[PDB]
Ligand binder design. Sequence first.
Ligand SMILES: CCCCCCCCCCCCC/C=C/[C@H](O)[C@H](N)CO
Lengths: 57, 283, 46, 193, 245, 245
Amino acid sequence: HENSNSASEGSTINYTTINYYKDAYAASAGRQDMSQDPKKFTDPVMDVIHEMAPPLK
Amino acid sequence: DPIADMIDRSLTALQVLPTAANTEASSHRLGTGVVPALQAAETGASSNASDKNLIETRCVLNHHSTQETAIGNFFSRAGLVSIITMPNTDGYVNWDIDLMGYAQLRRKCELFTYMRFDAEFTFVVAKPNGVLVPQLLQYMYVPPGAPKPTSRDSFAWQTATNPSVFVKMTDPPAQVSVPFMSPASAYQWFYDGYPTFGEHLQANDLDYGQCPNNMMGTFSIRTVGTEKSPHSITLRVYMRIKHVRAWIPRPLRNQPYLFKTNPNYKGNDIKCTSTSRDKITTL
Amino acid sequence: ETGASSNASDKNLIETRCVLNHHSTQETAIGNFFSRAGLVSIITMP
Amino acid sequence: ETILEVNNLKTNETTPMQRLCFPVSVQSKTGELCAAFRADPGRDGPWQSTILGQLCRYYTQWSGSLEVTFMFAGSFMATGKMLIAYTPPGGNVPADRITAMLGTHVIWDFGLQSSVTLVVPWISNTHYRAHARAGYFDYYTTGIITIWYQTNYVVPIGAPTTAYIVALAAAQDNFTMKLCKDTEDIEQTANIQ
Amino acid sequence: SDRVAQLTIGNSTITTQEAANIVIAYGEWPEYCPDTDATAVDKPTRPDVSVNRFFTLDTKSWAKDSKGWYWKFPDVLTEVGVFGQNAQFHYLYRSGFCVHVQCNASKFHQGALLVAVLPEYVLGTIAGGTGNENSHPPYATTQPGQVGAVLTHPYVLDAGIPLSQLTVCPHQWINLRTNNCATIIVPYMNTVPFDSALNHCNFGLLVIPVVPLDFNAGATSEIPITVTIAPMCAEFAGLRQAVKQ
Amino acid sequence: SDRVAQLTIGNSTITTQEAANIVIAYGEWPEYCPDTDATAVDKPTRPDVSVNRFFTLDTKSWAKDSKGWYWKFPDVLTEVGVFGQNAQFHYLYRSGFCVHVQCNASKFHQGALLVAVLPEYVLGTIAGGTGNENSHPPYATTQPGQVGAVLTHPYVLDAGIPLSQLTVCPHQWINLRTNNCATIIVPYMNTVPFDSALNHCNFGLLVIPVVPLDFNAGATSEIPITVTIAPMCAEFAGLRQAVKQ
Ligand SMILES: CCCCCCCCCCCCC/C=C/[C@H](O)[C@H](N)CO
């Protein structure tokens, strides 16, 4: 196969990349993932807050 | 177990979202105790009130894709990083690799703190008025620690180990691929501290903010022949960014840059972030 | 004196932890060390 | 293992056979130091004479642990004890023995077995290390290796009072390198032939 | 029923009766370094009681026209306690933190504080006023110690970025009509698993008064601010003689 | 095949090629204090790497007419290293020890040393010569530090007991024609499970030359003696600000 040496190998992007050489960083970018996690930036709070209840009672 | 003392959580996991979230229908509501319109911004969490909890909405199925907002599509565009001219007068230049010389790419990369990527470099070369003359050129990448060429015909130009390209002016522009080559796990654009030990004084005060995990050596071009070429040369270097992973976002800079190595700004004209108006009641 | 090199590791002299390293030895092979074009001749016709 | 050139003084340039052995003699005081050098295999100095130091010059970044083997070459009736210490960076060379014994250290005893191996373990913040140098690249420095008199060098009557010690250096099994470049030890100013 | 809170670690305990919730920065708890990411071979040392406790720094005075203050971490703790000794006798450290800021006032005062933790806070100068000098901050400005320094141009945070979007970092508010404390838990964030404590400073803690303090004449005109911090999962390696800086 | 020996603990290693066997004092290994004998309620701290290592003291000179030297434990280690810091910031400690004494000479010298560990070594005076003064030893004599003091009347050990039956304590010999080192492993021996390190001294280590050193003129007339020690299972409790003595 190819000696896999890229920047994104642990958690990677989609499997449509094209390559003709033996090193994996020569490959194209391809199309990207649609994965996202918002709640570790918009809700970094220990005790969970519900939208219905008062948050400070 | 003679000693009873010695024997002795992630918050949210990611998921894929191909399209923007839909809008579900709702009606009016009259009740006590339950209130989504009142929040508390003091806890540092953003509000979670949607559209349907404040007004009545219909049902809307939207298919708006979020593809253009990914970090891969945001960064994979070639931008100018260097202008290198050979009027220097001896037919060769040694340019230290520093990618913070032009403000349009510096502002995008300083949006994140840590970054990890592979590049792709492209060299577009012509005369200082766009004119074309048939001419042979040589590029050579010098890693840190390697000897550097001091003349147009030095022994460093034999390139027994160094990667090098030979290309003409009339040709299509050259392209290469560069892997991730830092000693650390990711590049960083900010380094709060001094690189060395020992006493810090006013003679060594310029060391503040220089991380050696980003210094990648130098870059050298020359005309191939042993004599003096009669033409002026000008090189432009463009860099793309592939396989991007980023960490820890930051506020964006709103002051104009002054140097390539430090975030110093002009202290007299502090630019206000927004364009000012006359009155608060009249737009 | 016997011409053999020593076989003492790190763990026999000090106390060590457990470290799983994934450092590849690909660049030190003789194929990658030599497969680079180098200058051998300059030939001029005056 | 190859021989390390510890005694690289300015007066030994016309008689360079003496640079491979450094002397140890009878002291009157206690706790003197006999030698000291940096443990950078890529920087110029004592490590440039090794087959490891010449092969690291063809690369840029290295990782793993080293080892330094000392071998006593005195008489049979002579004895003594030496202390070989390795100090992680942050401090300079220690002024006395009671400062230098805080780092990693091994106490050597002369006898039948005339060789001891101080292993220099890999303690660094980064996974790899570039070639250290004066300037900004001293951030990749790795420490200071000294050697001290544990006891005196005791000799009976009829045996000479000055012996020598040779030092050998090698790498451990978890050693690796990357990013091949050219060396600067060789040159070509004049044309060959 | 969540307005009261109690944090105990080590031999110390912090209690509060008007408190907001607890902020975990980027939703990650601090932890010891696993074997898959380790690079050092020496066995690390964990004091695990004498360094995992609440340390209390000095107390600033909030006036009616104050600018703001900043502390560099872990430069604030490197000369106090046994944590000041293990960071002087070693080469590498690794630790999380837990910041707690107290400032209390009565029901007749008003004001608002914005607390925020900012990683890799690199300071700058005004470049000689006219902008042609390549000035640099001195050693007393960049690493003030456990006293902390004041800000000069807080609108640009002395680093060229505006205050108006500082809340993208983990942050909380101290509004004087609801609560009196703010608390953030920060994990270890760096490109390398261990680092030196005397040449690297991970993050900066900023306390900036957005709304100015105001009261009627006759009230207690002395409003203090006190910062209390605590390391979480401290490890050390690479023993060498004591070097202070 | 048992004449060679190697002891490693911490980041230190001691090797010897002409060594006697290893002496475990009263046949007990040092260990952490179990819960059945504990009385303190606070959780103890164990540094467990930075204090369990070999520390090397100073070097004495053996002449032809020397009397003998003694070191008080753990007064010798209370100002060096991180063990010098944990014993200054705490109230209670508990640790074993491992003593190693080196003294080497050639095959043409002769002499004999008696090493011995003696617990509760209470010194005395000569009571004013004639015996009517209630004299007392000063602070510099009873706790000399990491230098160690010399003996005045070694036949009575400056405590009224004769040298002739000192071997009832754990002991070894350094005979210059066979070996060159001696090693004892001492557990923790006290009536209470923890104690202060600045007001109590557990045992004394005595090195007394029984047979005088003799050689012919021309040999190396400089015979040194070097002591190397190492704590084994050190624990600490009761944190308080630094008090040196
Ligand atoms: C024949 C190929 C020649 C081109 C060689 C290019 C290799 C150098 C790539 C450097 C990658 C970025 C490293 C650091 C970037 C910035 O200059 C620094 N962060 C400055 O702060």
